[PDB]
Amino acid sequence: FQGPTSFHVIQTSSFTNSTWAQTQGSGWLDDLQIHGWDSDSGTAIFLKPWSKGNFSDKEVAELEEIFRVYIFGFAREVQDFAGDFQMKYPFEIQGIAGCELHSGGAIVSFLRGALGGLDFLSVKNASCVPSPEGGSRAQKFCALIIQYQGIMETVRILLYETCPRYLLGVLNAGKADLQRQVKPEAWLSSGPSPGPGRLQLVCHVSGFYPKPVWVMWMRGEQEQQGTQLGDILPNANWTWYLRATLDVADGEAAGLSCRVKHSSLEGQDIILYWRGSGLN
Amino acid sequence: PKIQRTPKIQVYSRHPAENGKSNFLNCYVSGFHPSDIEVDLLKNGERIEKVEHSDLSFSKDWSFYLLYYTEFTPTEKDEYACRVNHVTLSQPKIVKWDRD
Ligand SMILES: *[C@@H]1O[C@H](CO[C@@H]2O[C@@H](C)[C@@H](O)[C@@H](O)[C@@H]2O)[C@@H](O[C@@H]2O[C@H](CO)[C@@H](O[C@@H]3O[C@H](CO[C@H]4O[C@H](CO)[C@@H](O)[C@H](O)[C@@H]4O)[C@@H](O)[C@H](O[C@H]4O[C@H](CO)[C@@H](O)[C@H](O)[C@@H]4O)[C@@H]3O)[C@H](O)[C@H]2NC(C)=O)[C@H](O[C@@H]2O[C@@H](C)[C@@H](O)[C@@H](O)[C@@H]2O)[C@H]1NC(C)=O
Numbered sequence: 001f002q003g004p005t006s007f008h009v010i011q012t013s014s015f016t017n018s019t020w021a022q023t024q025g026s027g028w029l030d031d032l033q034i035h036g037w038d039s040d041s042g043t044a045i046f047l048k049p050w051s052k053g054n055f056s057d058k059e060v061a062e063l064e065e066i067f068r069v070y071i072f073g074f075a076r077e078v079q080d081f082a083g084d085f086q087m088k089y090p091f092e093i094q095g096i097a098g099c100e101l102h103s104g105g106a107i108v109s110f111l112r113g114a115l116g117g118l119d120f121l122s123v124k125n126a127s128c129v130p131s132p133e134g135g136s137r138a139q140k141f142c143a144l145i146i147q148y149q150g151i152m153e154t155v156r157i158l159l160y161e162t163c164p165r166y167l168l169g170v171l172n173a174g175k176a177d178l179q180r181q182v183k184p185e186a187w188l189s190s191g192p193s194p195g196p197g198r199l200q201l202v203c204h205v206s207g208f209y210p211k212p213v214w215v216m217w218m219r220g221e222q223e224q225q226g227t228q229l230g231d232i233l234p235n236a237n238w239t240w241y242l243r244a245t246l247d248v249a250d251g252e253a254a255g256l257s258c259r260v261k262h263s264s265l266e267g268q269d270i271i272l273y274w275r276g277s278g279l280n
Numbered sequence: 281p282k283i284q285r286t287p288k289i290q291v292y293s294r295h296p297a298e299n300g301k302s303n304f305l306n307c308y309v310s311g312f313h314p315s316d317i318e319v320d321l322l323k324n325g326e327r328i329e330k331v332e333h334s335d336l337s338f339s340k341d342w343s344f345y346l347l348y349y350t351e352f353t354p355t356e357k358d359e360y361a362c363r364v365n366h367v368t369l370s371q372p373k374i375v376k377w378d379r380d
């Protein structure tokens with residue numbers, strides 16, 4: 001199957017001072033957002049009609065309540081212990097947790113935390129593992145948290161029992177959108193000159209879904225190894241954008257073409273031809 | 281918890297620019313830390329009021345990223361840009377849209 005193969009929740013908790021902290025949270029299938037968190041209500045926002053997967057409305061409400069209590073309690077506890085952990089304001093904590101489906105069918109769960117944009121801890125085999133970047137503070141944190149009976153058990157259940165069934169259920173529930181095929185469009189432009197007597201040619205590919213794509217500059221059937229793939233950029237409404245560039249000498253641009261291959265094109269590649277002297 | 285990272289700013293159109301044809305202007309802001317950021321889309325130096333944006337996300341290296349976008353009708357003379365302010369910047373950073 002094509003499309004996303006993992007589910008995760010994220011948290012960003014920004015501590016301005018000892019009496020002001022705010023948290024942002026959301027739920028994702030790879031980099032596609034399927035849940036939002038509404039801080040006005042302390043409840044989730046279901047972004048797709050299938051965002052609850054195969055879970056009952058009762059189980060979903062139970063999970064929303066766990067996250068609401070967690071978000072409030074997290075800020076409460078961090079503010080209470082910040083002095084003991086020698087925290088300097090402002091500071092920002094990030095967290096990600098979820099699970100992924102691998103080749104062979106195994107589902108692997110993960111949980112990572114960060115402080116100041118650096119790794120702070122991870123969960124390995126239902127244990128708190130301090131990250132070296134986290135120093136003695138992360139060691140102190142893990143030793144303190146594992147003594148919370150309720151928290152250790154809730155985390156274990158959510159990562160290893162709730163997440164794998166939720167993932168399978170939502171990959172199935174959302175397959176109309178997750179495994180849809182959206183055709184790219186492609187066009188050529190003449191980019192920023194890399195130097196004297198040199199040109200940059202740009203092949204743009206936009207609006208495709210899923211993300212895997214193949215773009216290359218060609219001279220006939222010869223793939224130009226000089227092709228530079230840009231990083232994949234997002235469009236709104238679950239599609240992607242990509243630039244493929246080629247730096248050439250002024251008199252070497254004639255004869256070039258850009259070829260695009262995508263899963264949605266049913267083996268019918270897009271071929272664009274670069275023409276010189278402002279003939280596009 | 282001390283190193284801050286300045287935002288990368290990439291401006292692009294959803295569709296090839298055709299003068300007088302409705303399109304979408306995108307501004308992808310990434311690689312920044314901490315998360316607080318102000319992003320505006322500009323038309324001839326003036327802020328566009330109706331701009332949409334993604335909820336906060338971050339990459340595996342913990343750097344934040346956001347997509348800002350708006351409907352736009354490009355012409356020959358009109359200029360478009362993305363203006364960003366962040367704690368790592370002393371002044372707002374402006375990246376102009378360039379179809380070429
Ligand atoms: C949401 O979906 C989940 C996935 O469902 C499957 O996939 C989707 C995409 C559709 O194709 C569905 O039709 C399909 O069911 C549900 O979770 C899965 O539920 C099934 C039960 O329905 C469960 O199967 C059982 O597995 C155990 C063995 O499990 C252990 O071992 C395996 C490896 O072998 C390991 O992977 C596991 O983690 C465990 O360690 C087995 O003993 C069961 O056998 C019994 O029942 C069968 C008939 O079902 C019978 O023939 C036998 O004789 C025996 O009595 C059975 O095969 C899956 O393991 C489970 N998958 C995961 C990853 O958890 C999910 O169901 C709910 O959770 C389940 C854990 C279970 O409690 C269900 O009763 C729940 O409804 C579903 N709903 C929700 C709300 O999550």
Ligand SMILES: *[C@@H]1O[C@H](CO[C@@H]2O[C@@H](C)[C@@H](O)[C@@H](O)[C@@H]2O)[C@@H](O[C@@H]2O[C@H](CO)[C@@H](O)[C@H](O)[C@H]2NC(C)=O)[C@H](O[C@@H]2O[C@@H](C)[C@@H](O)[C@@H](O)[C@@H]2O)[C@H]1NC(C)=O
Nearest residue numbers: 013014015016017018019020021022023089090315316317
């Ligand atoms: C603790 O931080 C509060 C929130 O800070 C604001 O939001 C952050 C996310 C960030 O953008 C920061 O720059 C902001 O200032 C402060 O409250 C704010 O205070 C300012 C200035 O007084 C005021 O203009 C804001 O409206 C107010 N915001 C909110 C949401 O309350 C705290 O200030 C104290 O509390 C205020 C309510 C007010 O009584 C003020 O006089 C206090 O200093 C910050 N507290 C401390 C002790 O520094």
Ligand SMILES: [Cl-]
Nearest residue numbers: 003004210211
């Ligand atoms: Cl994808």
Ligand SMILES: [Cl-]
Nearest residue numbers: 038039042071
């Ligand atoms: Cl809340």
Ligand SMILES: [Cl-]
Nearest residue numbers: 186187188272
């Ligand atoms: Cl073209």
Ligand SMILES: [Cl-]
Nearest residue numbers: 223224225226
């Ligand atoms: Cl080679």
Ligand code: NI
Nearest residue numbers: 085086137140
């Ligand atoms: Ni400490």
